[PDB]
Amino acid sequence: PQILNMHMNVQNGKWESDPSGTKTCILQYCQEVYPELQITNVVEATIQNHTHIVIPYRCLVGEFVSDALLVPDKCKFLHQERMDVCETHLHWHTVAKETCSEKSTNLHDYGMLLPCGIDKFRGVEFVCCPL
Amino acid sequence: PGPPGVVIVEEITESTATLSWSPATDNPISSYNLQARSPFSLGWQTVKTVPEVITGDMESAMAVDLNPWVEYEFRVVATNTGDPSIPSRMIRTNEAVPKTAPSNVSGRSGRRHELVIAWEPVSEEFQNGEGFGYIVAFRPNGTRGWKEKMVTSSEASKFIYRDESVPPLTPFEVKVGVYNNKGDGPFSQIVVICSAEGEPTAAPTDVTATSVSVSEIFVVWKSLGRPQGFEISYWKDSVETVRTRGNESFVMLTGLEGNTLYHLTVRAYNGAGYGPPSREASTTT
């Protein structure tokens, strides 16, 4: 489940337009699109029907479960966490990317940890891979 | 000899606490001895100190070999052996990286596409800091890379990974590490656990019931979900369930009524659940 505005059909696997045909340009919209699901939070991750490149918002269902990251061979699994802060997804992505740059590596994958608000988290998990 | 006054903890490190005390009363004292108590200690226990022997003229010492991030409580004892001193205030050693990986990394029963990993949780005595958690790493047996999952609950004892592409009974190399606020810890030794094996999917076939005595009926029968045993339900024309002696293909119902028609169904079970019932068999005692 993820999100005129378009959303993912969890039964078919394709993108459908706004159900009412009026909503254009987040958490409340996830809940109205998937009323059968318990949407508790949202987080940032090409759609036609004219093509557009967009980064969709994942409608997080139920209690938060951290993503399982893939660690290829010869790479490192790293993570940061602070119980005394609460930052955005863009912040932790930049922190993860800058952390791999300090070690002269690239940011291969990353995920969020410990939500503290609507699309705001207290930690980050990521994987740096060699050049 | 008299008891010392009270212990004053002056400096605290990760495994070391510098503490002093007011001297006891000599009624010639040979040495002072230090004891500590933690929520994980079995009462008061003696501690290693610097110097190794605290002579009678010394009013202070440095307790060593303490565990990081553990609440402690100290007291002094005089010996020429007298009564102990008044217990000190509750302190806590400084944080450190974790050094203890969880034990008994094993698997559990689960659904047809679940990899259920389990482990014995680590007590606060060996977490060594705040924000303690586990790092569950797993990979198909023989592969190179790892899939890693962060378990932020310190009391968590298992984790379930769901993958529709992983077939049942697939062997996975699994490690479970530790971490806290000050840094990562060690991983456990690699164990190999298989995935899934869901509920038994096939029902017993050729269920043959035959009257043996006036109160006994012998039953015999013949996949995806391995059977750990069979449960047999029998009713007259009062539902009663019975089970097998392990993974066998037969039971003997006892304590039945004489010259009475009984109906019967059999179904298998394992740790995940039950299977589909078999065709209804029936005989008369």
Numbering used by the authors:
A (entry chain C): 32 to 34, 41 to 62, 69 to 88, 93 to 96, 108 to 189
B (entry chain A): 670 to 696, 699 to 751, 755 to 896, 901 to 915, 921 to 968
Task: Copy out sentences from the published article reporting this entry, exactly as the authors wrote them.
Instead, they form coreceptor complexes with distinct transmembrane proteins to transmit signals inside the cell.
We thus initiated crystallization trials with the E1 domain of mouse APP and the FN1–FN3 regions of mouse CNTN3 and CNTN5 but only succeeded in obtaining a crystal structure of the CNTN5–APP complex at moderate resolution (3.5 Å, Rwork/Rfree = 0.243/0.291). Residue H137 in APP contacts Y681 in CNTN3 (Y853 in CNTN5), and its side chain forms a hydrogen bond with the carboxylate group of E686 (D858 in CNTN5). We found it interesting that larger residues such as lysine and methionine would mediate interactions identical to threonine and valine and wondered whether these changes would shift the respective positions of CNTN5 and APP, thus affecting the “fit” in the complex. Indeed, the shape complementarity coefficient SC for CNTN4–APP is 0.78, whereas it is only 0.65 for CNTN5–APP. In CNTN5, the arrangement of residues surrounding APP A126 is distinct because the Cξ atom of F833 is located 5.3 Å away from the Cβ of A126, which is too far to mediate a van der Waals interaction. In this complex, A126 only contacts the aliphatic portion of K821 and the side chain of Y835, which, respectively, replace the methionine and phenylalanine residues that abut A126 in the CNTN4–APP and CNTN4–APPb complexes.
